[PDB]
Amino acid sequence: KHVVLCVSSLKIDLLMDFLNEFYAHPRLQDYYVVILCPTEMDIQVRRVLQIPLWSQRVIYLQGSALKDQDLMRAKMDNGEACFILSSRNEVDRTAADHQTILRAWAVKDFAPNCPLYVQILKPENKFHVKFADHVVCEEECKYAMLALNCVCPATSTLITLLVHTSRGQEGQESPEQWQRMYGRCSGNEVYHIRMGDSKFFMEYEGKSFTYAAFHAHKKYGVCLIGIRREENKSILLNPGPRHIMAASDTCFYINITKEENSYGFKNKLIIVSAETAGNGLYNFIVPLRAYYRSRKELNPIVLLLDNKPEHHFLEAICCFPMVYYMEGTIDNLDSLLQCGIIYADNLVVVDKESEEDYMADAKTIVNVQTMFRLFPSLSIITELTHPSNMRFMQFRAKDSYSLALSKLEKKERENGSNLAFMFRLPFAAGRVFSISMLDTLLYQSFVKDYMITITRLLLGLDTTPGSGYLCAMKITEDDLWIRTYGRLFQKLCSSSAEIPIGIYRTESHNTLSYVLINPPPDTRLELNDIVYLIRSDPLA
Incomplete structure (x- = not known):
């Protein structure tokens, strides 16, 4: 059960958040986390390996990715996951790239079975590892966002908060009103249900894509996003009102907790x-x-x-x-x-x-x-x-x-x-x-394969012909014809095809701000506020 991670220069940061992130999964926790680096451990980081909990769940070893000996030393073939990572802070942006992509080859060479995960700074170089399982491309996404x-x-x-796992642990602190609600919806997350039926899937087999997200907010408060046809395995964002659902078709949806667990x-x-x-x-x-x-x-x-x-x-x-x-x-x-x-x-x-x-x-x-x-x-x-x-x-x-x-x-x-x-x-x-x-996206990807691709389509970047754009709409005085968020949702998608996700708020102390992701659709709305909706009409 040996998981591999490789990097040029470790620092408290990358490690920490990886770790803290990695064991956040209930399912896959027990693993031997393998570290490969050329340089010695610092006096700080070497201190976090000594702690009573992380001692025997973390294997650290000194060596590179190129030599075949040290790859053996990690037991790659046996190992269930292989992670390569790139240093952030460096003199040369163009060199780091070379370092990584290289490593990719060597690892792929050694054991051309195991999944492969890696980071890449410059977009230009994306082209070189297209063969790998999953690849996160820094600059494109940075500038895009x-x-x-x-x-x-x-x-x-x-x-960010979408791709971060939480239990809503943080909403119960009750210091105030907003924050109480603000943190509550943090743990909110994206999930995977496609197959068979479940609490949410059957409700509408035969009606359109739209009617689904209506009455999902009524019972549960789940709101779906897009359906991968079983054909080409292409992901869609907000398929138009014309698209239909089957018994076997993909549901991507957001909620505070997975459909199975509630x-x-x-x-x-x-x-x-x-x-x-x-x-x-x-x-x-x-x-x-x-x-x-x-x-x-x-x-x-x-x-x-x-x-x-x-x-x-x-x-x-x-x-x-x-x-x-x-x-x-x-x-x-x-x-x-x-x-x-x-x-x-x-x-x-x-x-x-x-x-x-x-x-x-x-x-x-x-x-x-x-x-x-x-x-x-x-x-x-x-x-x-x-x-x-x-x-x-x-x-x-x-x-x-x-x-x-x-x-x-x-x-x-x-x-x-x-x-x-x-x-x-x-x-x-x-x-x-x-x-x-x-x-974090990358780490988490290991348990979810729909996690990366979904992202780009949101931004810009990748468009396979059926798709949609993320747009926003201010709230003003004629929208106040609507009382709240749920009464909104159902009068919103009965005209055009758009789905909401979150909202935005402002109060005084210029002024403050908020984001609430998939709020229960009981919640009210002020004058100055904003909502994130998806609109697809490139293609009829």
Whole structure:
């Protein structure tokens, strides 16, 4: 029962969250977790192997992936799972790639049976391991998520909390009202039922895709997403109202628990900064002006980099309408003013710098913070690495909520630790997001094969012809013709084909924020609020 994991440089982080994440599964816990690394253990991490619980469930060994001897040493053939991982923080982005993909070969070579899981930084290199079971592609998803953050707010936090397992352990703390409800719906998760019948499957065999998600909210509060035909094993998002269900067809759905167990311009502008251009941003821009998107509401976008745009970028981006070049980092008031940050709306920054660990995320925290104070009417987004530092973001001399959050997060991390990082103000605002937070996706994938593919289709990225786009709709005074969320759901999908998932809320102390995923459909709605719906009409 030996599980394999390989990495170039371990750190408390990657390990920890893996571990804490990995044994979160009741089903598969007992395994020997195998660690392969060239360099010695640090004085910190080597301390977490000595703890009474993780001692004999974690095997650590010194060695590489290339030599055949040390592969033997791990008992690969016997081993039930093989994981390769990439270091995040490094001097060279382009080299790390080589390291990984290489490892992939050697492992595949050695034992071409076992599943194979791996991370890849640059999109360009995706092409090389297409042969592997499952592959998580960093940049494409990074830029994608953050990109969709410019249509609806807090795109990020939504997805993250989806892919994180919890019991609703965190909703019972009863400090307040919102948070009570906020955390409650955290444990919320996506699940797999297809086969036979169960509490939810039979209800409608013969009616459409739509009528299913209606009366699923009535009995249980489950809301399905998409049906894989048994034919091509292609996944669909929100099949149109024309599609039908069978007795054997795939149901993907969300619930809190598994079914079995219970030059001047016009519109708002957006400004992006990054270290270097790459095949990365080509995909940043895809979702912005797509097909489904209108030519009225487009958001012309300005690119601000440190280094001059490279040649390929030019041939790559000249297709689209509406973008330009401006240069300089985010330091100078002036470098930002030339662009019209004032006229503009949302701020996008993705940066980094090549001793202590969490620290290396500093260079950005700072540049940003200033902006919080320069423009109180302004909204911004950000990317760190270490999912510890989050709350260190937008902080005020005196806040009762913002400071009193500390005690609440500790009070979670001490009972049991999965998500310590939810409650924090800016995080739930979507103003914050991080890299290794989606990394969880990979670990969890081992138990769920529909977990990765589902994601891309949500964003942008992969479209097999039947599919749908994730869109949002503000709530206003004529929608208040509707009382609540359930009364909404049933008058919503009786006109067009759209399914809701979560919601969004705001109160005062500018102002605060929320995301509630699949709330019981009894819950009310204010004036300023937002909901995440899926709309498919590319194809009739």
